[PDB]
C-alpha cells in the first residue's frame, strides 16, 4: 500500500468556577472538487476557538486572520523552507491521501434499512452510506402527500446515516401507505407498504 | 464558504493544557477515519475496510503534537493568557435502529457544541451505571472550532429497563441527564 500523511504544524515565533484550560488546534483541510482536478489546501492554526493564522493554496502564502498571528504569519513567510514544504503538501498530503479514498471511502455503499412503525406513521431510513437519500411518502394511488415532517440528515458517527420521515394523515379502512426510498447504493428504489 | 465535493481534514491536531491531553485524527466528510493512541503509539482505524488497506505512521502524530504543545505556549503569553471560555453542550439521545423488544439495538448519545474538549459521558440503566457495551468516538472537529463526541451503548430492549445518558461539562452548572425509554 501507501502510508498516508498529514499536514505539518509550523513552529511558532518565540523559541474561578471551573479549572482554566488553554486549547490549541491545528487543522489541515483538503478540499476536493471534480476528482483531483480542483484541490485546495487550507491549514488552520487555532488558539482556543480563534483562527489567527492560515495558509491557503489559492493564496500561496501564510496570511494572518486575527491580530493574534501577524507575528506568526510573517515568521513562516520569511522561512523559505516552511513555505516550500507547505505549498508541497497539496500533493504530498491532499492529492496523496485522496488516492486511498478512491479505493476505500468513495467506494463505500451501505444499503438503508426501511421500516414503517406508528409513533402518526414514521418511516425510519437507517444505516446507509453515503449521505444522499430521497424519501417520499405515498398514500394509495401514487398520492405524494406533502404534509410530512422529516428530520435533518442524522449522522450516527459510525460511517452510517439515518433519517426519520413522519406522515400525518387520516387513514380510512381501505387506504395504503407506502414509503418510497432512493439511495445511490440501490439499483431500484425500496418500497414498504402499510395498511 | 468554500464549495467542494469532499472536505478532508487530514490532521485534526488538538492539544490542551488541562492534564496535558491531546488528540490526532483524520476526518473525511465529517467522519473519523482514524485516531492515534498517543500513549500506545498506535493508529486505530474506525472501519475494517480502513484497517485492511490504509496505513498511517503513528509517529507523525507524536511529532506534530509536540509542535502543538510548543505553539500553545507562545500564544498563551501573546494573548495575555486568554483562557478558553466554556460552552453549554447539546445532548441528544436516540437509537440507531427502530426499537423492538428482545431484538438488540444500540443507543446513540450525541453531545454537540463541546468546548473545551473535556467531558464525562456515562450511561445509566435504572440509576446504576453501565459498564459493558460502551464505545465512544473521538472529539470530532466543527467549522466553528468546537467539537461533538458520540457515545454508544449496545443494549437489549426491555420494557422493564430504562436508560439515561449522563453528560458532565464545565459549561453546565449541573450534570445533564437525557432520558430515553422504549
Amino acid at each position: 500500500g501507501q502510508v498516508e500523511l498529514g499536514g505539518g504544524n509550523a513552529v511558532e515565533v518565540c523559541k474561578r468556577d471551573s479549572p482554566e484550560d488553554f486549547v490549541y488546534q491545528f487543522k489541515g483541510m483538503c478540499y476536493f472538487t471534480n476528482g483531483t482536478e480542483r484541490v485546495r489546501l487550507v491549514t488552520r492554526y487555532i488558539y482556543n476557538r480563534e483562527e489567527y493564522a492560515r495558509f491557503d493554496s489559492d493564496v500561496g502564502v501564510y496570511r494572518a486572520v486575527t491580530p493574534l498571528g501577524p507575528p506568526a504569519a510573517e515568521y513562516w513567510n520569511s522561512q523559505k523552507e516552511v513555505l516550500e514544504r507547505t505549498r508541497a503538501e497539496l500533493d504530498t498530503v491532499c492529492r496523496h491521501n485522496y488516492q486511498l479514498e478512491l479505493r476505500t471511502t468513495l467506494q463505500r455503499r451501505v444499503e438503508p434499512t426501511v421500516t414503517i412503525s406508528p409513533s402518526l406513521l414514521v418511516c425510519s431510513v437507517t444505516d446507509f452510506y453515503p449521505a444522499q437519500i430521497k424519501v417520499r411518502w405515498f398514500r394509495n394511488d401514487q398520492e405524494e402527500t406533502t404534509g410530512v415532517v422529516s428530520t435533518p440528515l442524522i449522522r450516527n458517527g459510525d460511517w452510517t446515516f439515518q433519517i426519520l420521515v413522519m406522515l400525518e394523515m387520516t387513514p380510512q379502512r381501505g387506504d395504503v401507505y407506502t414509503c418510497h426510498v432512493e439511495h445511490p447504493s440501490l439499483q431500484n428504489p425500496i418500497i414498504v407498504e402499510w395498511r | 464558504d468554500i464549495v467542494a465535493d469532499h472536505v478532508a481534514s487530514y490532521g485534526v491536531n488538538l492539544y490542551q493544557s488541562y492534564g496535558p491531553s491531546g488528540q490526532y485524527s483524520h476526518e473525511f466528510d465529517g467522519d473519523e477515519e482514524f485516531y492515534v493512541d498517543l500513549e500506545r503509539k498506535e493508529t486505530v482505524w474506525q472501519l475494517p475496510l480502513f484497517r485492511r488497506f490504509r496505513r498511517f505512521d503513528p509517529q507523525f502524530a507524536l511529532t506534530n503534537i509536540a509542535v502543538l504543545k510548543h505553539n500553545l505556549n507562545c500564544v498563551i503569553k501573546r494573548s495575555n493568557s486568554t483562557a478558553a471560555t466554556n460552552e453549554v453542550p447539546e445532548v441528544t439521545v436516540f437509537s440507531k435502529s427502530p426499537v423492538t423488544l428482545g431484538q438488540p439495538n444500540t443507543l446513540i448519545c450525541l453531545v454537540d457544541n463541546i468546548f473545551p474538549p473535556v467531558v464525562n459521558i456515562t450511561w445509566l440503566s435504572n440509576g446504576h451505571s453501565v459498564t459493558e457495551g460502551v464505545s465512544e468516538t473521538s472529539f470530532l472537529s466543527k467549522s466553528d472550532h468546537s467539537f461533538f463526541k458520540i457515545s454508544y451503548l449496545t443494549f437489549l430492549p426491555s420494557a422493564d429497563e430504562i436508560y439515561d445518558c449522563k453528560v458532565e461539562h464545565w459549561g453546565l452548572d449541573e450534570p445533564l441527564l437525557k432520558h430515553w425509554e422504549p
Partner: T-cell receptor, first 110, second 108 residues
C-alpha cells in the same frame, strides 16, 4: 552556525563520552547521527523542545538530552571498538532544512 | 530504503555527468541531496518534494521522479570532487535515510 564539541576525542573500552552540539540560533530541533565505514550515516535520535521526539535503531546506551537553549548532548555508555565514528549533528528550525556541523571524531582504543 | 549509483565516479575536468538516487519509501515527505568532504560535515544542496520537480543551483540540477532522483553536473571543477549524499524523509519520523553516496573525483 552549528558547533560541535569536542572536535576530537579518545576513550577506552567500557568508559563513556558526552558530545555537545549548539544548533543555529533560532533553531529548535537537533538530530544526531553516526557515520561509520560500511554502515554510512545512521540516525541516532532527534530532540525538540528538550525531549527526544524521534529515535533510531541504536541500543539503549546511546542516549542524550536537550536544554532550554535548544543545545543538545549525546552520551554513549560502555564504549565499544565498533563505536568509533564521526558523530554528526543536524540542526533544524524544527522539521524543514537540516544543517550539519563539522562533527565529533571519536576513536575508541583498546 | 535508498540506494545511489554509481558508488564511485572518476571523470576528467569538463565532462558532464549525472548522479542517480533510487528510493523505495512509503509516504515520501522530501528527498535531500548533500555534499560531503572526507573530514567535513555534509553540505546542503537541494530538497525535492513532488515528482517532476526541477531545481537548479549553479552548475548542479536536481530532478525528482516517482522512482528515482537525478543530480546532473555541468562542467565540473576539482572543487566539485566530494561524496554526494542522497537522503529521503518519509513517514512520521523526521529522520533522514541517507544512501551510501557517490564518491565523485574530478581530476584537473
Amino acid at each position: 552556525g552549528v558547533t560541535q564539541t569536542p572536535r576530537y576525542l579518545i576513550k577506552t573500552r567500557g568508559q563513556q563520552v558526552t558530545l555537545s552540539c549548539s544548533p543555529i540560533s533560532g533553531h529548535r530541533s537537533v538530530s544526531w547521527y553516526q557515520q561509520t565505514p560500511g554502515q554510512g550515516l545512521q540516525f541516532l535520535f532527534e530532540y525538540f523542545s528538550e525531549t527526544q521526539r524521534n529515535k533510531g535503531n541504536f541500543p539503549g546506551r546511546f542516549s542524550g538530552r536537550q536544554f532550554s537553549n535548544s543545545r543538545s548532548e549525546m552520551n554513549v555508555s560502555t564504549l565499544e571498538l565498533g563505536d568509533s565514528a564521526l558523530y554528526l549533528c543536524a540542526s533544524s528550525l524544527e522539521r524543514d532544512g537540516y544543517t550539519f556541523g563539522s562533527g565529533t571524531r571519536l576513536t575508541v582504543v583498546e | 530504503q535508498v540506494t545511489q549509483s554509481p558508488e564511485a565516479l572518476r571523470l576528467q575536468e569538463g565532462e558532464s555527468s549525472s548522479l542517480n538516487c533510487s528510493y523505495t519509501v512509503s509516504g515520501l515527505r522530501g528527498l535531500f541531496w548533500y555534499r560531503q568532504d572526507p573530514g567535513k560535515g555534509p553540505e546542503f544542496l537541494f530538497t525535492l518534494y513532488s515528482a517532476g520537480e526541477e531545481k537548479e543551483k549553479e552548475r548542479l540540477k536536481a530532478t525528482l521522479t516517482k522512482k528515482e532522483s537525478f543530480l546532473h553536473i555541468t562542467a565540473p571543477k576539482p572543487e566539485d570532487s566530494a561524496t554526494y549524499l542522497c537522503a529521503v524523509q518519509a513517514g512520521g519520523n523526521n529522520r533522514l535515510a541517507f544512501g551510501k553516496g557517490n564518491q565523485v573525483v574530478v581530476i584537473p
